[PDB]
Symmetry: D2
Subunit: 481 residues, 4 copies
Amino acid sequence: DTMKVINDPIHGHIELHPLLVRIIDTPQFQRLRYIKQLGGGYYVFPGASHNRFEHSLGVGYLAGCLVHALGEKQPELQISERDVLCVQIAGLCRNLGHGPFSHMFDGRFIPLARPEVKWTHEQGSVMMFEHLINSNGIKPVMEQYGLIPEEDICFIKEQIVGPLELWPYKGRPENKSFLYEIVSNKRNGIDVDKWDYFARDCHHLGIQNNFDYKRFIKFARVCEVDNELRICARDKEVGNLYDMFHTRNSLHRRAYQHKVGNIIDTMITDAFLKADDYIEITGAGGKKYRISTAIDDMEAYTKLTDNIFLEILYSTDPKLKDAREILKQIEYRNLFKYVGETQPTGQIKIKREDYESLPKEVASAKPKVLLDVKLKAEDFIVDVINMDYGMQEKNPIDHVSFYCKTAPNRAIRITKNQVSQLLPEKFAEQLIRVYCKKVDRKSLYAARQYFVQWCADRNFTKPQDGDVIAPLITPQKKEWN
Amino acid sequence: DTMKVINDPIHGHIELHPLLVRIIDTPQFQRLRYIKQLGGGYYVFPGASHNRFEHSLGVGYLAGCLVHALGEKQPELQISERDVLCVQIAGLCRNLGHGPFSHMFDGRFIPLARPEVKWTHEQGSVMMFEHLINSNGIKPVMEQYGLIPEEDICFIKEQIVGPLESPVLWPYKGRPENKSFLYEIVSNKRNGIDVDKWDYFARDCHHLGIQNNFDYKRFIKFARVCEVDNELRICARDKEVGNLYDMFHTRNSLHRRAYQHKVGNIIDTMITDAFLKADDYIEITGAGGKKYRISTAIDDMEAYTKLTDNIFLEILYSTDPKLKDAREILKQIEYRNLFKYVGETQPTGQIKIKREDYESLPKEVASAKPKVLLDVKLKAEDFIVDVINMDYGMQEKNPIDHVSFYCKTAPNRAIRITKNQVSQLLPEKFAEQLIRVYCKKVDRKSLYAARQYFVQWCADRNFTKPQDGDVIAPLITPQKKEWN
Amino acid sequence: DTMKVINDPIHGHIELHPLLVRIIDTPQFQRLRYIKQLGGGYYVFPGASHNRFEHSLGVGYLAGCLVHALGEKQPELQISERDVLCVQIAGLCRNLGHGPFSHMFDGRFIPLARPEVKWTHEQGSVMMFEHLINSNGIKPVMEQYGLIPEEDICFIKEQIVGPLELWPYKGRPENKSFLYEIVSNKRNGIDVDKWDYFARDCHHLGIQNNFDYKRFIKFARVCEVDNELRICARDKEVGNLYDMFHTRNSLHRRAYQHKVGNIIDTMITDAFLKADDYIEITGAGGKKYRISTAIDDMEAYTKLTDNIFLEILYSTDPKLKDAREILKQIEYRNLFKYVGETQPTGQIKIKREDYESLPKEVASAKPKVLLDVKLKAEDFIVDVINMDYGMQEKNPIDHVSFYCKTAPNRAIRITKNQVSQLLPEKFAEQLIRVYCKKVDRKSLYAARQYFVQWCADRNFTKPQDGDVIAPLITPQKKEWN
Amino acid sequence: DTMKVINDPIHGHIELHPLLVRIIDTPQFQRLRYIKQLGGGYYVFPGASHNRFEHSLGVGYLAGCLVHALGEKQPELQISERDVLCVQIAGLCRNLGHGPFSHMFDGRFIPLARPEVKWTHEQGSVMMFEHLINSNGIKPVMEQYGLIPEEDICFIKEQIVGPLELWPYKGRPENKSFLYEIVSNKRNGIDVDKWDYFARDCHHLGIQNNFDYKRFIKFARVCEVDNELRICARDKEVGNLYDMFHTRNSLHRRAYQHKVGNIIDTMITDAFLKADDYIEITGAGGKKYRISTAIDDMEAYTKLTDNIFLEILYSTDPKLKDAREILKQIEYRNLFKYVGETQPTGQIKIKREDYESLPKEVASAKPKVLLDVKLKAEDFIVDVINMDYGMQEKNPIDHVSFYCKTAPNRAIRITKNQVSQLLPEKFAEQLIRVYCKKVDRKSLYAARQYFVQWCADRNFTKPQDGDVIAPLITPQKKEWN
Ligand SMILES: Nc1nc2c(ncn2[C@H]2C[C@H](O)[C@@H](COP(=O)(O)OP(=O)(O)OP(=O)(O)O)O2)c(=O)[nH]1
Ligand SMILES: Nc1nc2c(ncn2[C@H]2C[C@H](O)[C@@H](COP(=O)(O)OP(=O)(O)OP(=O)(O)O)O2)c(=O)[nH]1
Ligand SMILES: Nc1nc2c(ncn2[C@H]2C[C@H](O)[C@@H](COP(=O)(O)OP(=O)(O)OP(=O)(O)O)O2)c(=O)[nH]1
Ligand SMILES: Nc1ccn([C@H]2C[C@H](O)[C@@H](COP(=O)(O)OP(=O)(O)OP(=O)(O)O)O2)c(=O)n1
């Protein structure tokens, strides 16, 4: 076994250590070739055909680039070849837990199918990783290349999911704290996973990426911060860091929360819910699982990919007829219709436990206009989207440490007002999208009247096309003019 | 209803006329989202995730660009909105006939499963198109936007597959000779210079991570229609001739580096093998509920609509013991336990290997008598021999001899340009064959032996010396004076 | 004369009508080959070798694209071939008035050399254009291609500089008002000039452009707004427009106001000031002009380019010795030293009339640190930079008209709160950079103490590296601690 | 002194060791900012504004990349930090000897101005390098960073110009032979200089580069070949090497030998020749030199750049009137007119000693056509261009060593027939361009008749537009019909 070279359109020629090759060449990893990175986004942006497999390679490559760069500038950190490989493996493997259509699965489907469970792709990635190791005899190979499985497997998992329960980590001591900031940075979100998806998603979507990760790496150093060794950025890069999160938010607005990409994800989720009683996935010992339960058996989950969509679409079983019809409407582009978008005002914050009551509220609005049709709660979809800088209401830059050119070993803090007055004043907001399942002209007209009346009643912002779609409704609200 | 805009990473914002939207929003078209452009190439080049759906949009877009550019520069050609839409539709629809893993299916699988049949993706595209039209009520929509279905449907099909009759005089019925140039946009049967190549060069390069050297926008800017032997044809500006030679050089480089990558091909081969073993057991429901097989879905478009890369996963995920052998081949692909590459050679002199002799080649390799001590003996069945025909699209011919040009001083006068009027640094031949050999036995001793047989066979047949011949078979290469 | 094709790395193959070729092939236009787009920025970003010539071709090309696209989508606007040519010519010609090192010349040099005069490159462009036309016999050529010189020359100039004093324009009537929004958009700054420089500057700087001008063009329409036909954007695109200005501000921060690029512009300006009495430029009738007076004669200004730098550097005249020495310090990279950056707080706004008093204030500060050297006012440079979204304190998106998909001919307004709470709360700010002309270690240390003490006294923001560069000074300021 | 980072649009963030910074920050190196890479090509391709300075940084960066990659893969080579710096410096400095408009100067001007001398930019680079070192106190700085000036300066020069005088090199012994193949590869032309110019020229010209230099670097190894350690490429990569030279030949054809770029170089050369007696350049000890003699004094040569073009163009001295007129014709685009192109046939090879007799031959042709004007020898320019793969008639790939995956330490040879029958059969050819100095319509018509008659008489290839430009002439030649 020697190193392999793979050619990636984002990163060029990437070298893979033979241990990494061994991990990659498994059913558990190769599974990621059948899971689209952007889910239903490929149905809106046709270049977004990329899958989680190639993203994962990229994350593993970049994790190696950052850790190598720190070691090379700062030999006194004692980064070992062992550390490098562990960080690469965590990078390669942090997407293992994703399900069909990526965020559709853990963002929409599992919360509706299994409301009692607390499932994340992160937790999935740990479980899949364990299963990958054990199923494929990876521990001896790890030993062969100088890893110590007990500690190092723990380290890899902690890099992916955080502490498995004072210094809370067991895989590495505080001396090496900075290593936990590479793959999945729990402190402020600045990690190599974002850097790959910014570049890769842009390349495929046909939108241009403004964040320069190579620059960031060149300016990164490790410094002591409150008795931990942490990654610090050069002071003057602070503007580029705000820009990084601004770029993330733009990509969410333009692509990852595109109103039609989201409705396609919703329709696919609906098909999956209707198919859940009838599709069977064979797991360990031949036992059968369903779409919603494959998360309980990694051998079954290994076989749970975007293929489920085609299995439903191509089915002839009359039990799958309702599921199959929904997917057929997607092929004909007979989609649920977008009604509009609004946002809460003031200190109003809509909680997850109130989401279900929203279609009911919309249908209870009493727009004072003549309507041909009356719509009911079940005719409406209301999608609430939390947009933020990765840390709820907090500014992630308040949780970044910097250094200055005159004293590169001294960590400092930089506040928002030390950077620019042109920066955001808030770091979290909610968008509310409404759609109608009745697609005819009269229903849609009515849906608009209810929607805008509901915005008015709730004191939400005026939809951008409010005056055009509901001219008789918007005058009543003085706050809108 | 109205135009749609689609954002494409290669071409940017592309506008689609509502008739084109209606054709796209059908099961027959959307099917192409589940067929990888490069087949098994994705298993070597991880960026090559792209599918035939997006390539088709690009071909439809570029077809519109070229036809529109000609109409704007030369109003006297009388290109109508109707002509534009027909050319866009042919562009959009010329990939409809591709099967699972694209060229794997019609290049390897169908020729082995149905040796008696003559199937091409082109023919498949015509049949799928007819089925798409009829199944989705497209004729009335065509009429609504000014098309005349009888003549225009014919035109579109002729653009994809060529003349629908044997002519052995103007062979086309969809459009008359005064519009002949319209047949050179989507699929150019005269010299291969068409918008389909231009999309795939750009798109494949973008995904593969290899850079594209051909500038199609430049070509379009310099293109004109001129009278050539009583036909109106597309002519390029004289001084672009070097760029045209370069276009075909680029196509060949892409074939060498990517589309005929030795491992991409062996993965296509292993997938084809799995499909062959699964063929008796997978059932695909077609028209009237009839069941078809992978190898027979080509006979029913309703079944073919449901035949995509999904077959690979249906096999891989199966539990039926009847699919065990097929499933086991695909599992070897996931573990990367692939057949091993032994080497590559080429014929010399006038030697040209015919398709009818392909099956006899593994037997010849196993019959070689390398004078070396061998711990294992290998048999015919242990070898795969892959013969690849590399050319400039027209067998032994120079396609540039079939291009018409114009000069700046007389833009309406068509001329010819020969190779010697361009450069002595250009290729002296336009076709060749590569021969790759692989071993199904992957252990160290088998592979060493496979190498001795292979190189001895090259020597016996008077093929070229493999590049690593002296290293892999040091005791064999000395015997051949021509190599030394 | 037929159309020429030029290959541009940003826009690809651009077609030039023969009238345009005629305008380009003149000493007045070709001059722009010898004026770097980013001035002293090339001395920081080595890829930024591009000149105003090629930018100008790109602006002309894009002005033609926008006007052609509007005409094709909306024939009812009656856009003529004549209109298209006039808009292209304005596009081609709006950079003719730039001087050596572009914004150095009209931003630093002329305001110091000719404080009494009110010079802008826009005015320069009109004067140069007039000279170009008259010197080269262009009027008959214009007539030959269907233009009417009296009106059309007026139109072109108005596009570049605005009204040459209700409807204030004479070159075209109100039914063509939208034509005035292409080349230099005085209403809200959304014009094709920015779209070319974003793309071209980024290509050359090695920074990625996030604004998609082709998308904008596809979504642009003309609609009636308060009895004028104006260019309107699709409502959906409002986020992309905020992003456009956010990109402009990023490019200013990273590149166009780079602290070292600015100080190189400042040093070149200093050399020019010291050479001004001795360099002679021959203008009309053999009269001699100076660098500072060449703006009064277009024939002399035609010969005023970046070459002046080399003429000074290569001179042997002892009268040019002091000028020549400054330029030689640039070659050895013995540059004035950056001390730091701060910003005013509260409602404090520094007025132009107070700029000259600032170095004095810095030198009057009384740090509370033992200093080897004492610095004087003349040792300090204070650069005050006004960063905004192109319209002072105003939000340019409040001056943009939009349309909705349901009524494409009805113009509407969209407020900031209808878009996002994550957008800027203010649209203008000031940055203050200080440099020291004494470059030795002890002078620099001292300069830092004065600088930070001055920040404290004035209640400016704490410099990002304040605690490192002036540890004994920052503790006194409770607001910083 | 610490490392500087510089952002390049081709290579991204490049790190420069402080010794390199010291060499860069000199009048001798900064000079290269005033010399366009592609000479007159900027007058055809407006994006080609780039200068030799930024190309030189890139060549220095890539030279470091290759040497570092070899050292990392093969520690047994004992590549030192010292070796790396020397190779970087040779890379940085190999373009120092270029003159105004790059290849114009040593390709056209010096051969005509100083026919008795033998000048190359390579020689110029060694002389300029020596001058740079001596004039700027660089030897002590080299010692400060561990170089040994005697042997290392010799090494750097040998890398640029080859042996200064069995192992012919003194700067390094045979066990480091491979180091001589990085910066200017005398054996087969595969060096980092090409790799930078391919990427950079393409970026600027707006043509796409198809050679992947990073791939090449990843597959490169050092192996023993005939008792020397040489760089070997992986066998597989042989097609990509033929493609590299094919790319080089395409770039020459499209860009570097563009027929109008060449005539602009020729017109600038003509202006320089006419100005040569009058322009004075001050060198060492105040001595005055001319454009043609500045090559004899490095202090004067330091001041010899593209600025000489503008100094002529802006001059008022009646002595410079003829020179100035030629440059003015360039601004008006009144260029010498292209008549056509042809090639010799068979084994016919035109020798340099016969170049001057060619315009006479053209004017002596007797086309049997009625002509208004008669042309003379002095009205014709005949430009003979030798196009090849860098080694005259030879195939450079016959001088490349390869290795195979099964024995990575064993060097091998690969012949053309082992690669492909679709490759070139010859590796050198000549193009002949003819132009007319009389630009009126009747002269040009006549020039075309003479030209095509001359092609017929000499048995050259039929010009591509022959039948259109000379319809009465081409019928006489049965070989063409
Ligand atoms: N480059 C870029 N592309 C975008 C952006 N938003 C959407 N796209 C792409 C995704 C699609 O391929 C295409 C059209 O998306 P749009 O959102 O304009 O179309 P959609 O039908 O969703 O809007 P509409 O029906 O007009 O309300 O444009 C953006 O902000 N930038
Ligand atoms: N992309 C590309 N650009 C080229 C090529 N050759 C030249 N160009 C660029 C350089 C110029 O900016 C522009 C026009 O060059 P041409 O050689 O087509 O024009 P020229 O006037 O020399 O030819 P003509 O007067 O038509 O014989 O195109 C090429 O092969 N590829
Ligand atoms: N890509 C990118 N390049 C930048 C940015 N800011 C500056 N550059 C370029 C300009 C230079 O070629 C190179 C280094 O510039 P820097 O501003 O980092 O160095 P400078 O010496 O000004 O700062 P220092 O002395 O470290 O405080 O990077 C940026 O935000 N993005
Ligand atoms: N007639 C020419 C020859 C060269 N060049 C430019 C294009 C390349 O960017 C560079 C190549 O020549 P250099 O002097 O930089 O180096 P070489 O002469 O060594 O190039 P090569 O080795 O490829 O012959 O010069 C040019 O514009 N015109």
